[PDB]
Design a protein around this nucleic acid. Structure first.
Length: 523
RNA sequence: ACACAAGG
RNA sequence: GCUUUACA
C-alpha cells in the first residue's frame, strides 16, 4: 500500500511542471486512508498476531518514502530559484553592471506558499494522530506534563491494562508523531532562513553572502526543538531527537551545543549509535574550533564569544589535543604556537571565575563522553587524567561555592563507572578535595534518602548510559510504579510544597551527596 | 630560583 | 634523569 503511493508520488514529483493541486489532493487522500487504517489496526490489535502489527513500520515508511520526499522536493525548488538569483548576480558583476543586480522576490513566494500549504496539511495530520494516540487509550506511562503541553484530556476510554506491549506500541507511535512534527518544522525553518528570507530583497540578500549564516536567529527553530524535547520526554531512550537537536545547533554555528546533543544521542539507552558520533566527529575533524581558538587568543575579533562560549572552545580544543591530534596537536601547542598548557590553565581559572552549573554539566558530559569513546589506552588515560584535573578544579571551587547538582553528577559518574572511580580514588588530591567539600554539609542521613519527585538533573539524564540510565543515590522505589509518571518527569505541581520546593530539593540533594560521597571515600 | 602538568 | 612550553 505504502509502496504504491510512493511510486505514484515519485511519478508526480518527477514531472517537469508541478501541478500543486494534484499533489495536495493526493496527499490528502493518502492521509485520510492511513488515518482510518491506523485506527482499525490499533483496534484490531488483539485479533491478528502481534508480529503482524505493522503500524510502526508503516509510519516510518509513510514519513521516509512519502512525506519527507515531498519536503525535499519543495526544498529543491527553493534551491533552483535561489541559484537563479545567484546566476543573475554573477552575470551583472561580470558585465560591469553590479549595481543593476536586482533580487526577484516574485516566484520565490509562490513556491513557498505551496510549500506552506503542504506543511500545514501534514502538521494537522500528525497532530490529529498524536491526539488520537494520546487520548483514545489510557496510558499511565504518558506524563501529565505532556498532556498539559497539548491540553489533551483522557476521557473514560479503553483501558488496555491487558497488554503493556500495546501501550508501548502506542507510545512509540506518539513519539514518531512528535518526531515528524519536529522534522517538518525544522525543514520549514531551514528553507525559510536559507532560501526564502534571502530572496525577499537586496536588503536581505547580501548579508547571507557576507555572513555565512551568523545564525543568532535560533528563535526560528524554537518550536521544532520543543517538539523534539517532547520526544525525549516520552521515550528518552531513543537517539533520534537528540541528534536532530544537535543538527539544529550545528546549523546555527553553535558547534559546542551540537556536540553535546550528538553525544547525548550516542549515549541514549536504545541508541542506534550511528548519527551522533558521525555528526560530532564531522565537527571535530573540521577547523571551526581551531579558528575560534585563534580568534579568542588574539583578542581582536568580530567573533566575540561569551565567557561560557570561551570555556566551551577551550574544552573542545584541549580534548581534541589528545583525542584528535591530527587536528589539535602540534607538539606541545594546539595550533599556531598556542600551548596546550596555556589553554588548560585559562579554562581552569574560568571554572572559578565564571562557574555556571549548566555549563559545567555540559563540560562533564562532553569530556567523559570522549573518554568513553576512546579505545586507545594511552589516549583514554591522558583524557581521564585531564578530566580528573578538571574535576579537581570543580571540587576546589565547591570548597566555597554552591553547585550541588554538579556534585551529584560527578559522584554518580564515579559511582556508575568503576574504572573512573578507581582512577579518582588513586589520585590523592581528588580524595582530599572531596573530603573538604563534604565536610561542609551537615546530614543525619546514613542510608540513601527517599524523595517525592525527580529533580531537574534526574529528568535531564534519563536513559543516559553515562550514569547507566538513572541516578542511583536516591531510594526511588516508590516512584517507579506503572500507574504514575509525574514524579519521574519531576512534575511537583501536585505536591503541597508551595515555595518550600527549593529548600526541600536543596536538603534532599545534600543528603544524597553526603551519603554517596561517604560511600565513595570509604572505599 | 626550587616544588606541578604538556611535549621529544 | 635531562631538555622545552605553561601555570602557581
Amino acid at each position: 500500500a505504502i509502496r504504491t503511493y510512493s511510486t505514484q508520488l515519485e511519478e508526480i514529483l518527477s514531472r517537469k511542471f508541478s501541478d500543486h493541486s494534484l499533489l495536495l489532493g493526493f496527499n490528502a487522500s493518502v492521509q485520510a486512508k492511513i488515518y482510518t487504517w491506523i485506527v482499525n489496526d490499533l483496534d484490531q490489535y488483539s485479533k491478528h498476531p502481534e508480529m503482524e502489527f505493522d503500524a510502526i513500520g508503516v509510519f516510518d515508511k509513510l514519513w521516509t518514502d512519502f512525506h519527507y520526499p515531498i519536503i525535499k522536493f519543495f526544498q529543491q525548488q527553493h534551491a533552483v530559484v535561489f541559484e537563479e538569483q545567484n546566476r543573475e548576480l554573477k552575470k551583472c558583476q561580470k558585465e560591469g553592471r553590479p549595481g543593476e543586480f536586482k533580487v526577484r522576490p516574485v516566484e520565490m513566494r509562490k513556491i513557498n506558499d505551496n510549500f506552506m500549504k503542504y506543511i500545514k496539511e501534514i502538521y494537522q495530520f500528525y497532530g490529529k494522530l498524536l491526539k488520537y494516540f494520546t487520548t483514545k487509550y489510557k496510558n499511565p506511562n504518558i506524563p501529565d506534563k505532556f498532556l498539559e503541553e497539548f491540553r489533551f484530556t483522557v476521557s473514560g476510554n479503553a483501558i488496555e491494562c491487558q497488554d503493556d506491549n500495546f501501550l508501548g506500541h502506542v507510545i512509540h507511535l506518539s513519539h514518531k508523531c512528535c518526531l515528524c512534527l519536529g522534522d517538518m518544522l525544522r525543514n520549514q525553518a531551514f528553507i525559510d532562513t536559507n532560501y526564502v528570507v534571502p530572496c525577499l530583497s537586496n536588503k536581505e540578500f547580501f548579508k547571507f553572502k557576507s555572513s555565512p549564516n551568523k545564525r543568532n536567529h535560533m528563535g526560528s527553530y524554537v518550536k521544532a526543538i520543543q517538539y523534539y524535547n517532547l520526544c525525549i520526554m516520552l521515550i528518552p531512550a531513543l537517539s533520534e531527537p537528540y541528534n536532530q537537536i544537535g543538527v539544529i545547533y550545528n546549523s546555527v554555528d553553535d558547534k559546542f551545543n551540537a556536540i553535546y546533543w550528538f553525544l547525548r544521542s550516542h549515549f541514549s539507552r536504545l541508541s542506534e549509535h550511528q548519527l551522533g558520533f558521525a555528526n560530532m566527529s564531522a565537527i571535530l575533524k573540521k577547523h571551526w574550533f581551531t579558528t575560534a581558538l585563534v580568534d579568542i587568543v588574539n583578542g581582536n575579533s568580530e567573533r566575540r564569544f561569551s565567557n561560557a562560549n570561551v570555556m566551551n572552545v577551550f574544552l573542545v580544543c584541549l580534548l581534541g589535543y589528545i583525542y584528535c591530534p591530527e587536528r589539535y596537536k602540534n607538539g606541545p601547542n594546539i595550533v599556531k604556537k598556542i600551548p596546550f598548557s596555556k589553554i588548560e590553565t585559562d579554562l581552569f581559572k574560568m571554572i572559578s571565575s565564571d562557574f555556571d552549573e549548566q555549563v559545567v554539566l555540559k563540560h562533564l558530559v562532553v569530556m567523559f563522553g570522549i573518554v568513553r569513546l576512546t579505545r586507545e589506552d594511552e589516549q583514554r588515560d591522558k583524557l581521564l587524567r585531564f578530566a580528573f584535573r578538571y574535576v579537581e578544579k570543580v571540587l576546589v571551587y565547591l570548597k566555597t561555592g554552591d553547585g550541588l547538582m554538579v556534585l551529584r553528577f560527578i559522584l554518580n559518574l564515579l559511582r556508575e563507572n568503576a574504572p573512573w572511580l578507581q582512577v579518582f580514588t588513586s589520585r590523592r588530591n581528588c580524595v582530599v578535595y572531596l573530603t573538604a567539600v563534604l565536610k561542609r554539609f551537615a546530614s543525619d542521613s546514613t542510608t540513601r534518602p527517599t524523595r517525592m519527585f525527580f529533580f531537574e538533573e534526574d529528568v535531564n539524564f534519563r536513559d543516559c548510559s553515562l550514569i547507566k540510565y538513572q541516578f542511583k543515590d536516591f531510594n526511588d522505589e516508590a516512584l517507579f510504579s506503572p500507574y504514575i509518571a509525574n514524579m519521574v518527569v519531576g512534575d511537583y505541581s501536585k505536591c503541597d510544597l508551595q515555595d518550600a520546593v527549593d529548600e526541600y530539593v536543596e536538603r534532599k540533594r545534600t543528603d544524597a551527596v553526603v551519603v554517596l560521597g561517604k560511600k565513595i571515600l570509604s572505599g
